[PDB]
């Protein structure tokens, strides 16, 4: 139940080990007062400093004046930090307001339309996001709820997504989690300890063209429905052909061990690993950090489930976009559909107790 | 503890220790063939024996013939039994099939409509339920998903609810959970250790009038949304007045400790605890075994969260019905809304390796 340090050159929640639970909220800005929004950012940063340490926001959850609403809603009382990370991101639409147009990063690229998508606009986009990840779902919900409350009147929650379990790994020394198709997901990602790969593929640099984003990353979110009924009808061989790995061990086709490096030529030309591999994409590499979800039933007798895909990269134009383009022929496309999407510029870290979310963007 | 025995005089998941996570699914029957439904119950029981021991169903999740779909969908490979319990129940609607009408228990009473109810029929009812409780949500989800797959052609999933309580890896097992209103929830309840209280209040007895139910119990499910944002605007005194207990410690008004017995007369007349207490209900007492839920954000931007209330009782007419009726004037009603409901007759246990779910109802 240990805490994850909140301050750093980078925001936590990216290279951090992937926690068990996600609560992801996209917000829209409702205030037109730049000074009021800066004020909110600072109040949110202060709150996050408490939440990630396992403390109550403001003056606490009780012990105040009886006639006043408690500052903290209280449902995390008695709980540990639970590795909570809170990661803030700025969507392209934010840059139409507060006079931020010229500061919109070119690497914050709007996505093209991809064949087969059916994106729900209401659960796509967003002026900003907060990614709350923790090992305790009550800690994660509490953090989002209290941030939303602090922001009432200045921001609204556009859409949110809970992930009940991870489908990603930044720790190759630990067990790779399985997604709801039954396959390990996260074997060949980027590790928190891979500083050179993180610099090459995840962290933006000043010379990239957007100084305020130095030490930040760019986030692509994609809500992916899984055609479970169809998948569960597929043969074992078909399922393994789709990915290029065997199901039980998760090794590349022909190999004995999960982490043995793939020999792509041995997979089907439309195998997912073969098309997504960096070597098939001129070196493009992603830090995937997604989570499984379930959304009740489809109203038609079947569990409704999927994967909330999250990818961090130094530049969307050289990460998610080329890779997802190469997935146009992916054998996996028969079993999935992309149904929500959003991109965000995730700023650099909160340097210290005097700093605040967005300070490099908004100045001061 | 890592596992809970599947076999017994009673079904597990009622009096056994409360696990961290829930996947509750209601099923509807899609076959008229009684023998085919009995065959399913036998295959389901066989699967449950595997799942509650952390093993894959059938011949496994891999290694079979390449041209066959795997018997198990694989998403729990590498996980642990996680204290998984699988508890089956039969809804009133089941008894209109297979000639069972004259075997519906009188104690399986339909619930009256209660003041303020706003029940989504799509998330209510069901011919059957399976309550899957585990410490790891993916174990619970895997269990539901695979039972649903095994049963496909004979049953469908009507509705499905994920829930969470504490996270036991970081939260002391004796610490009362808090609900999403920030209050301790479960202080005065029946515990599975109180054998005499279970016999009095929870288990059906032969003399009660339905022999096949002897050693079973009756379950009431209620999906109860909370008006989170209005609640969080209420003063600390208003919130405590609603329950009759203070928020921080959870002690009854006028008392110092959580577990001190309440002086109901010092609570406001409409306080939840005063209205729900057995002394206010002719001694009616419930085994509450619910879970908090958070499903996301609704269309208005508000948090879709609440309590998935579950209560077990020897007779719905003498348990949940009187107590819920007594909540007509509950001050808590301002802040909650019941939005889904179902009742189930939970049969006695699977006695040994030759027994099967429902054998006392269907006959052997
Ligand atoms: C529901 C959708 C998806 C599922 C079930 C899925 C599943 C998998 C699995 C099982 C693997 C092999 C193990 C691993 O190395 O992680 C994999 C690899 C990978 N996937 Fe996906 N994936 C999905 C969507 C995506 C998308 C949208 C992208 C990017 C646009 C993507 C990019 C990658 C990459 C880059 C790899 C590693 C390839 C390598 O370098 O070997 N995946 N995925
Ligand atoms: C969102 C809805 C509900 C919330 C937030 C809630 C919350 C609470 C709280 C905070 C307590 C005091 C601590 C304790 O558990 O002893 C309590 C007690 C209790 N509640 Fe509820 N409750 C809800 C719905 C219900 C319903 C629907 C029933 C039954 C029909 C019920 C029956 C009880 C009982 C029997 C007690 C114990 C009273 C005693 O014997 O002292 N509750 N509840």
* DSSP per-residue letters across A75-124: TTTT---TT-EEEEEE-GGGGGSTT-GGGS-TTSPPP---TT----GGGS
From residue A285, give the alpha-carbon distance in Å to each of A222, A278, B28: 17, 6, 46
Contact B47, B119 (CB under 8 A): no
Token duo for residue B242: 């609603």
Report the separation in Å between the CA atom of B321 and the middle of ligand 2, taken as the mean of its atom positions.
14
Token duo for residue A138: 């009550």
CA distance B107 to B239: 35
From residue A108, give the alpha-carbon distance in Å to each of A41, A126, A127, A159, A312: 21, 13, 13, 20, 11
CA angle centred on B293, ends B145 and B280, rounded to 5°: 120
Report the separation in Å between the CA atom of A167 and the middle of ligand 2, taken as the mean of its atom positions.
36
Contact B129, B218 (CB under 8 A): no
Report which protein residue has its CA nearest ligand 2's atom 15. Answer: B186
In three-state form (DSSP H/G/I as H, E/B as E, the rest C), the secondary structure along B133-168 is EECCHHHHHHHHHHHHHHHECCEEEEEEEEEECCCC
> Are residues B98 and B209 part of one domain?
yes
Experimental technique of record: electron diffraction
Do the Cβ atoms of A75 and B179 come within 8 Å? yes
Backbone angles phi, psi at A129, to 5 degrees: -135, 155
Token duo for residue B8: 């017994």
Q: Is B193 on the interface with A (CB under 8 A)?
A: no
CA distance A156 to A168: 29
Q: Is A246 on the interface with B (CB under 8 A)?
A: yes
Token duo for residue B293: 């839920």
> Are residues B36 and B21 part of one domain?
yes
Alpha-carbon radius of gyration of chain B: 21
Token duo for residue B218: 């009756």
> Are residues B293 and B222 part of one domain?
yes
Contact A129, A147 (CB under 8 A): no
Q: B126: closest CA among B221, B28, B222?
A: B28
> Are residues B158 and B218 part of one domain?
no
> Are residues B273 and B146 part of one domain?
no
Domain membership flag for residue A228: yes
Report the separation in Å between the CA atom of A333 and the middle of ligand 2, taken as the mean of its atom positions.
47
> Are residues B264 and B117 part of one domain?
yes
Residue with tokens 């997979």: A267
| A206-210 CB contacts, 8 Å cutoff, 24+ apart | A208/A107, A208/A314, A208/A315, A209/A105, A209/A106, A209/A107, A210/A103, A210/A105, A210/A106, A210/A107, A210/A345
Domain membership flag for residue A80: yes
> Are residues B301 and B233 part of one domain?
yes
The interface residues of chain B toward chain A in range 285-344, judged by CB-CB distance below 8 A, are: 292, 294-297, 301, 303, 305
Domain membership flag for residue B191: no
> Are residues B17 and B149 part of one domain?
yes
Alpha helices (H) in chain A, listed in sequence order: 34-51, 137-151, 195-201, 228-233, 236-243, 272-276, 320-326, 359-362
Contact B148, B132 (CB under 8 A): no
> Are residues B54 and B16 part of one domain?
yes
Sign of CA dihedral B227, B232, B235, B237: positive
| β-pair partners for B183 | none
Judging contacts by C-beta atoms under 8 Å, the chain A residues touching residue B156 are 300-302
Domain membership flag for residue A179: yes
Domain membership flag for residue A245: yes
Residue A328 has what DSSP assignment? G
| β-pair partners for B66 | none
Domain membership flag for residue A10: no
> Are residues B327 and B225 part of one domain?
yes
Report which protein residue has its CA nearest ligand 2's atom 4. Answer: B307
Judging contacts by C-beta atoms under 8 Å, the chain B residues touching residue A165 are 136-138, 141
Residue with tokens 């030309």: A269
CA distance B133 to B115: 31
Beta strands in B207-290 (DSSP E): 217-226, 287-288
| A53-61 CB contacts, 8 Å cutoff, 24+ apart | A53/A3, A53/A6, A53/A81, A54/A1, A54/A3, A54/A79, A54/A80, A54/A81, A54/A82, A54/A84, A54/A139, A57/A146, A57/A150, A61/B182, A61/B247, A61/B248
Q: Is B306 left (phi over 0), alpha (psi -120 to 50) or beta?
A: left
Residue-range definition of the domain harbouring residue A51: 21-350
Domain membership flag for residue A224: yes
Contact B145, A228 (CB under 8 A): yes
Q: What is the dihedral of CA A240, A243, A249, A253, to 10 degrees?
A: 80
Backbone angles phi, psi at B48, to 5 degrees: -60, -35
From residue B151, give the alpha-carbon distance in Å to each of A57, A168, B51: 48, 30, 15
> Are residues B296 and B237 part of one domain?
yes
CA distance B181 to B334: 13
Domain membership flag for residue A299: yes
User: For chain B, what is the domain count?
Assistant: 2
> Are residues B299 and B160 part of one domain?
no
């Amino acid at each position: 139940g240990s805490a994850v340090p909140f301050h750093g050159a980078h925001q936590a929640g990216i290279a951090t080990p992937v926690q068990d639970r996600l609560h992801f909220a996209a917000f829209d800005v409702t205030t037109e007062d730049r000074a009021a929004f800066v004020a909110l950012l600072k109040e949110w940063t202060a709150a996050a400093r408490r939440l990630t340490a396992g403390h109550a926001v403001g003056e606490g959850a009780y012990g105040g004046l009886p006639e006043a609403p408690p500052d903290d809603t209280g449902e995390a009382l008695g709980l540990k930090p639970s590795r909570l990370t809170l990661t803030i991101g700025f969507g392209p639409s934010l840059f139409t307001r507060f006079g931020l147009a010229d500061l919109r990063p070119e690497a914050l690229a709007d996505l093209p339309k991809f064949p087969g998508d059916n994106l729900d606009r209401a659960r796509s986009g967003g002026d900003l996001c907060v990614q709350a990840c923790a090992d305790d779902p009550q800690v994660a919900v509490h953090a989002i709820r209290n941030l939303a409350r602090i922001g009432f009147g200045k921001v609204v929650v556009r859409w949110s997504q809970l992930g009940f379990g991870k489908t990603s790994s930044t720790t190759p020394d630990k067990q790779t989690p399985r997604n709801l198709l039954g396959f390990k997901d996260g074997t060949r990602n980027i590790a928190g300890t891979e500083k050179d790969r993180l610099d090459r593929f995840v962290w933006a640099a000043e010379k990239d063209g957007t100084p305020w984003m130095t030490g930040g990353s760019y986030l692509v979110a994609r809500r992916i429905r899984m055609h479970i009924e169809t998948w569960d009808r597929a043969s074992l061989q078909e399922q393994e052909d789709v990915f290029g790995r065997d199901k039980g061990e998760g090794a590349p086709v022909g190999k004995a061990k999960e982490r043995d490096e793939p020999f792509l030529k041995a997979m089907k030309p439309d195998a997912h690993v073969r098309l997504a591999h960096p070597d098939s994409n001129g070196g493009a590499t992603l830090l995937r950090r997604g989570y499984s979800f379930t959304d009740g039933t489809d109203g038609l007798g079947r569990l409704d489930a999927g994967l909330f895909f999250l990818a961090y990269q130094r530049d969307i134009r050289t990460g998610f976009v080329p890779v997802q383009r190469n997935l146009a022929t992916d054998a996996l496309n028969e079993f999935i559909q992309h149904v929500g999407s959003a991109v965000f510029a995730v700023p650099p870290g909160v340097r210290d107790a005097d700093d605040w979310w967005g300070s490099t963007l908004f100045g001061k």
